[PDB]
Amino acid sequence: NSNICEVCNKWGRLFCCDTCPRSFHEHCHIPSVEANKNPWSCIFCRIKTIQERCPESQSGHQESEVLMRQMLPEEQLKCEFLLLKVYCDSKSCFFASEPYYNREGSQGPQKPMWLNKVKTSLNEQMYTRVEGFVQDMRLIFHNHKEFYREDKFTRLGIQVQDIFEKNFRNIFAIQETS
Ligand SMILES: [Zn+2]
Ligand SMILES: [Zn+2]
Ligand SMILES: [Zn+2]
Numbered sequence: 001n002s003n004i005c006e007v008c009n010k011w012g013r014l015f016c017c018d019t020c021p022r023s024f025h026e027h028c029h030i031p032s033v034e035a036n037k038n039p040w041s042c043i044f045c046r047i048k049t050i051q052e053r054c055p056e057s058q059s060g061h062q063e064s065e066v067l068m069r070q071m072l073p074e075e076q077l078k079c080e081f082l083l084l085k086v087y088c089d090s091k092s093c094f095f096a097s098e099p100y101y102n103r104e105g106s107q108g109p110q111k112p113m114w115l116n117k118v119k120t121s122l123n124e125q126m127y128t129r130v131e132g133f134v135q136d137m138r139l140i141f142h143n144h145k146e147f148y149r150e151d152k153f154t155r156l157g158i159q160v161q162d163i164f165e166k167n168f169r170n171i172f173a174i175q176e177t178s
Pocket of ligand 1: 005006007008009010024025028
């Protein structure tokens, strides 16, 4: 196994996957690494298993259909994985914890949102459809873009949103388009 966490790239108290060489800190893995379970498979392995059991799941889908799916176990897992993929980018540190807004010439968003809040929401099964999760994730970046206006710091929102969107397309097998 790897000697650094797959999500944060640091050493520490790591849990090793039994079916791939990845490792995780306890709260870096989503869901948090499970108490017992021997063997244990990580979220990357569990997502690969879904794909292997249903190869047709990789044919193209329409986003509108994906957003209306109910959050049954497999869609719950896919949202957890997609959240994990955003945390894997180091620039996610800007969007992880609860923000605050006091900048000359800007007003804070009406509905602040951050990655830890989405993490808790998923953990507490607060989303009933994929749409709920996706709307909150997109809100994070939209709030950022709107608040930082012309400051070049707005680009962080663009960059992390691009990571989100690419992984969303991959994980939910959205039909490729030009
Ligand atoms: Zn970590
Ligand atoms: Zn694994
Ligand atoms: Zn099948």
